[PDB]
């Protein structure tokens, strides 16, 4: 996260760290959506241009974290992967369209003050909240600039109108993406960055006061560049796929 702040304790208890076993290092962000399902970006797991193709046994899920590097005794929980599910039409070849994957844990995780699932949007919350100017919140342990933080970073960012998103890049944008970030003339700044990949873009619904994950950190051209915006997978647009997976594989 660039130009964000240290998270408060327990502020994002759905935050998941995807952790590489060997060598031991951050792989990506992710989010807890139930006691055994974790949501992330497909490119965290599969991205052939960079020879990235992780198997279940390559990875661990660390839940409940605050500190980036430290082992947080009596607080974090570390889980093994039972199975990865990547969207069958994830488009790694062109623009990262449908950049979404699910991970099923070997064993259910115990909720705690620091570990708790986020909600996924229904059509009405999505229609009400995904509007240009409405702010969401992005969290992650990724680069501080286009360097690595000691603790979880947080930044709030406004959704940007679709024509502005489109006009800010040569890449082809789809209905399965949205962009967010301040304009140059809005003065404020902030962005996700490398290492934030797979983490959540959340919004707090003013109707029921719950947090919903509207987006997944997916891609951006540089980080916190004037006239550029961060792009997020549109979670509601892919929920049919999410439910199907969760329904067929429980």
């Amino acid at each position: 996260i660039v130009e964000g702040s240290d998270a408060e304790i327990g502020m994002s208890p759905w935050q998941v760290m995807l952790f590489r076993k060997s060598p031991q290092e951050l792989l990506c962000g992710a989010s807890l959506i139930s006691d055994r399902w974790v949501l992330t970006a497909a490119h965290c797991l599969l991205y052939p241009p960079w020879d990235k193709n992780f198997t279940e046994n390559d990875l661990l899920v660390r839940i409940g974290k605050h500190s980036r590097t430290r082992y947080e005794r009596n607080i974090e929980k570390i889980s093994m992967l039972e199975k990865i599910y990547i969207h069958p039409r994830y488009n790694w070849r062109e623009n990262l369209d449908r950049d979404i994957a699910l991970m099923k844990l070997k064993k259910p995780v115990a909720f705690s003050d620091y570990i708790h699932p986020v909600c996924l949007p229904d059509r009405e919350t999505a229609a009400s909240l995904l509007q240009a100017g409405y702010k969401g919140r992005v969290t992650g342990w990724g680069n501080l600039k286009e360097g690595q933080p000691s603790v979880l970073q947080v930044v709030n960012l406004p959704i940007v109108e679709r024509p502005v998103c489109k006009d800010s890049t040569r890449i082809r944008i789809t209905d399965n993406m949205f962009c967010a970030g301040y304009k140059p003339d809005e003065g404020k700044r902030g962005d996700a960055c490398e290492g934030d990949s797979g983490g959540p873009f959340v919004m707090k619904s003013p109707f029921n006061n719950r947090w919903y994950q509207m987006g997944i950190v997916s891609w951006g051209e540089g980080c916190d560049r004037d006239g550029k915006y961060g792009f997020y997978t549109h979670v509601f647009r892919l929920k049919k796929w999410i439910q199907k997976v969760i329904d067929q594989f429980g």
Partner: peptide, 10 residues
């Protein structure tokens, strides 16, 4: 860079 984790998880 990262503190080693309990062997049980590896």
């Amino acid at each position: 860079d990262f503190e080693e984790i309990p062997e049980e998880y590896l």
